[PDB]
Design a protein around this ligand. Structure first.
Ligand SMILES: Nc1ncnc2c1ncn2[C@@H]1O[C@H](COP(=O)(O)OP(=O)(O)NP(=O)(O)O)[C@@H](O)[C@H]1O
Ligand SMILES: Nc1ncnc2c1ncn2[C@@H]1O[C@H](COP(=O)(O)OP(=O)(O)NP(=O)(O)O)[C@@H](O)[C@H]1O
Ligand SMILES: [Mg+2]
Ligand SMILES: [Mg+2]
Lengths: 350, 359
């Protein structure tokens, strides 16, 4: 019954701090940057995640700046933020108070692989669709996540709601500005990243999404490797050897450097039999060498693989209705507004 | 597998093999009891028993591009050193893919790796006796002094590529599949080397890196053998640089220039005292060596040969030094002119008085 009370600034709206009291503080996670706690708001009894990172008081926190602009049902909500000091004197910590979300795609996928089963396709559809909406939204602001991986896909198992989280690697990509190639986790890195390109687009997130789709179908990572070399060999084993043109599209400086000559492995034979053709088709349009050839997130949402989600009789296996799938805004559809006639089916929102 | 026969039940494979070193006088080689001991992205390693001598060999089988000559082969053919796994002979064959050529490298079989040994001690919540840390690392630094003296950078120094005889304490560097001759001015790919062992210039995507990346990697192996876990783990380069920065502290503008000139936004963190990184009673000489290997500035790192001459290895130069199991240490002082070429005067430290005594 130990209560902590802070004066915390709401994430959205005007910069108007209020007194916030919370209790039942326990460490849900540790990342390189800092610790994540669970806590219960005293007023509502609602559970929150508090992400605590060391802050260079001088400069502004990019993660905070980005999350204050984000309002989407498939992105974890910033409820408050506040500053605290401890450990070393003169060390200030930024605290992000987020909606608590009990599971991850990582943990749920790990359960099914440990028990020798695959995630039922209905969840692959729900989870990937919600990921592609969250990407469609941030990409419409020029914001690239740059760390799309199962650990950063939060899940409410009861409602089947997915929330994208962890904007610590996130950055507004501006044409002609170079960006670091050393972002994004091992198995989910786009080939242009592995080739050390600094002129990459938001399409790195689509490749990462494709790696998550493939992984949920296979029950293991599709492009594993301890080195970039090992990863590229695993990519080449599936896509075949990239053409000199395809290489120019990824990183032009790496044309003269050479790798084994291999023909593309048929996508249908990459996955087990009775993996739905539409799932396989979508993968092939996400995991493309040429960044500009990859589907956009919004195009991905409109893919036939997600048609079951647009069926008026679709239900969760636990009997509940699907979560919000169709509450698109103008911002979200801006990349291609005509897709609205596919994305919003006749039965939705009337 | 050119010709296959049966001998008292056992399957015998007979091949015609080109010798590793010497003129091309083909040798007839017969082996049995084939089993898999290793996999890679583009490689399979078998154990096999030679029919006559009964002695074990490793056969690394890799797909051969008909276009170009195999770089791993070209490099291994040039190498003769007691701390580098010997290419006995090589032969071509068919394999898993019909109409495809496979290069087979027949190597000395070595039963263990630093990876497997380190893992045994980690699981049992022990650390390797420091005499083994000294022997393994010293032998690694000799292997790197030798290849670097030909301008050849390994580019994949990691515990899994360090073969061990546990009884003799002999270490052999293996896996020249990433190895290349670095030529000042020629660019090189930044996506080589296993993730935990990658030098910061590689993480920053440099293409003008020197053989000193192998010294960083060996620094990571030493630290890991002292800690019982990787010193700089991370799923992303970002995560790895955070771990590096937590120890080394934030790199100066000039340190970043020395690593990759092209390259931002990392916490202003002060250096952790290296002493507080390792368990209490870690030999100070071990910690000093680490600090001189794991430097941001590639040129500031010790050369392999300077590493060998470091005070951490003084116990190896003691004339009364034995393995715990009572046996003599392996050869540590049989240096060649080639091996010493980077700094011949270091011989005055490297070859101890007792090793110069007249026979
Ligand atoms: N809102 C939340 N609710 C519940 N768990 C959360 C929440 N946010 C983060 N976590 C958990 O804490 C982990 C780490 O949080 P994250 O936001 O990724 O911090 P980080 O320290 O920046 N990690 P990373 O950037 O991936 O190296 C996540 O993968 C989740 O398992
Ligand atoms: N001479 C040998 N004797 C015994 N085991 C060996 C020998 N050579 C290799 N191995 C084993 O096989 C593993 C792989 O060998 P390696 O030559 O690295 O092949 P690879 O398929 O190219 N692997 P890698 O490049 O690291 O991804 C080593 O880590 C050892 O465990
Ligand atoms: Mg995360
Ligand atoms: Mg290896």
């Amino acid at each position: 019954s130990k209560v902590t009370t802070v004066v915390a600034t709401p994430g959205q709206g005007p910069d108007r701090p209020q007194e916030v009291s919370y209790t039942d503080t326990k460490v849900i996670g540790n990342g390189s940057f800092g610790v994540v706690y669970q806590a219960k708001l005293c007023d509502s009894g609602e559970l929150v995640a508090i992400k605590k990172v060391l802050q260079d008081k001088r400069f502004k926190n990019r993660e905070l700046q980005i999350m204050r602009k984000l309002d989407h049902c498939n992105i974890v909500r910033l409820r408050y933020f506040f500053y605290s000091s401890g450990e070393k004197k003169d060390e200030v910590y930024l605290n992000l108070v987020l909606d608590y979300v009990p599971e991850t795609v990582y943990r749920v996928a790990r359960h099914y692989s440990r028990a020798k089963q695959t995630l039922p396709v209905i969840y692959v559809k729900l989870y990937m669709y919600q990921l592609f909406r969250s990407l469609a939204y941030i990409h419409s602001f020029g914001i690239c996540h740059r760390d799309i991986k199962p650990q950063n896909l939060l899940l409410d198992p009861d409602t089947a709601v997915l929330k994208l989280c962890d904007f610590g690697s996130a950055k507004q990509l501006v044409r002609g500005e170079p960006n670091v190639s050393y972002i994004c986790s091992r198995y989910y890195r786009a080939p242009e990243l592995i080739f050390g390109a600094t002129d990459y687009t938001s399409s790195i997130d689509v490749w990462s999404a494709g790696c998550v789709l493939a992984e949920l179908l296979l029950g293991q990572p599709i492009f594993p490797g301890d080195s970039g070399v090992d990863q590229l060999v695993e990519i080449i084993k599936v896509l075949g050897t990239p053409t000199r043109e395809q290489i120019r599209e990824m990183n032009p400086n790496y044309t003269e450097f050479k790798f084994p000559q291999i023909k593309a492995h048929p996508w249908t034979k990459v996955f087990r039999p009775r993996t739905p053709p539409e799932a396989i088709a979508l993968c092939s349009r996400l995991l493309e060498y040429t960044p500009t050839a990859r589907l956009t997130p919004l195009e991905a949402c409109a893919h036939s693989f997600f048609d079951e989600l647009r069926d008026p009789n679709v239900k969760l296996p636990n009997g509940r209705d699907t979560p919000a799938l169709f509450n698109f805004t103008t911002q979200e559809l801006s990349s291609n507004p005509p897709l609205a006639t596919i994305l919003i089916p006749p039965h939705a929102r009337i």
